[PDB]
């Protein structure tokens, strides 16, 4: 599958401007300067960059390069546990599969970041893992230009809970969870509206949908994942903060890394939202939505 080479390819635009050219053999002054410039130019942001230079300078008395990688990877792991295991030497070839904490995943994000396409790729990912998957077409206030989630469901043989344009999205989500439960489904992906400037406040609508999910199943949704487009950069972060404050994210999916030189944005994303990156979109293929691996990510940022 060339998992690792696919990621390197997806991060090529980001890496080939400055990162891979850093003169790791010169005197400190030069190499530190080039490193800071490369990090800033990749959208790592000043805060995170300044911290790296501090962690690698005074501290980090192993190989400079090795130090850098270690700090970048550390910034990308919100979970202390997995970070500990990593330090203990835990480094499997294939990144362990992402397992949703519960049966329902509420998918959120602004209109156009790729929520529909992402859910389709997730449906495939989880079907291949043997899960029985269901979709709920929550964005019922629009005819999502292009391929509707309903059409993707037919292509993948995944049932799609849906209603006429304008249907109460909370009521739809409740029906989907009941159907998921009644029909013995392992996972339900609830798509949601993404337009921030309509007659219906978006955050209020999402909170209503989440409430409805919980009403049908008191423990759900155990995952709330925000989809963010890498191309957008640090812009999709202020908004991300609002989604987090309204519905409580448990994870982030970053798409279209291959279309920007700003792939370092995943660092500020994790430091700001303090939730894990679940998958990364490295291309537009069905298997181009890869489960995130901090170590592999950082290696691809700086190598090849």
Author numbering: 1 to 304
Reported in the publication:
The functional core proteins of the signal recognition particle (SRP) and the SRP receptor (SR) (called Ffh and FtsY in bacteria) contain GTPase domains and form a distinct subfamily of GTPases. These GTPases mediate cotranslational targeting of secretory and membrane proteins to the endoplasmic reticulum (ER) membrane in eukaryotes or the plasma membrane in prokaryotes. SRP GTPases are unique in that activation of GTP-hydrolysis occurs upon formation of a complex of two GTPases. Here we report the structures of two conformations of FtsY in complex with the substrate analogue GMPPNP.
In addition, apo crystals of FtsY pre-derivatized with chloromercurial nitrophenol (CMNP) were grown and solved by multiple wavelength anomalous diffraction (MAD) and used as a molecular replacement model for the apo/GMPPNP dimer forms. Finally, in the ground state apo FtsY, the position of the guanine specifying Asp258 is further extended than in F1 or F2. Interestingly, the interaction distance between Lys256 and Asp229 is maintained but the interaction with the the P-loop is decreased by more than 1 Å. In apo FtsY, the IBD has re-structured and as a consequence Arg142 and Gln148 have returned to the active site although their positions differ from the active form. By superimposing bound nucleotide from the active form, F1 and F2, a clash in the van der Waals spacing between the apo position of this motif II arginine sidechain and the γ phosphate position of bound nucleotide is observed (not shown). In addition, Gln148 has rotated clockwise (from the same reference axis as above) greater than 2 Å from the active position to locate itself again out of the active site but in the opposite relative direction than in F1 and F2. In apo FtsY Arg195 is positioned away from the phosphate-binding cavity. The preceding glycine, Gly194, forms a salt bridge with the P-loop and orients the backbone nitrogens away from the γ phosphate.
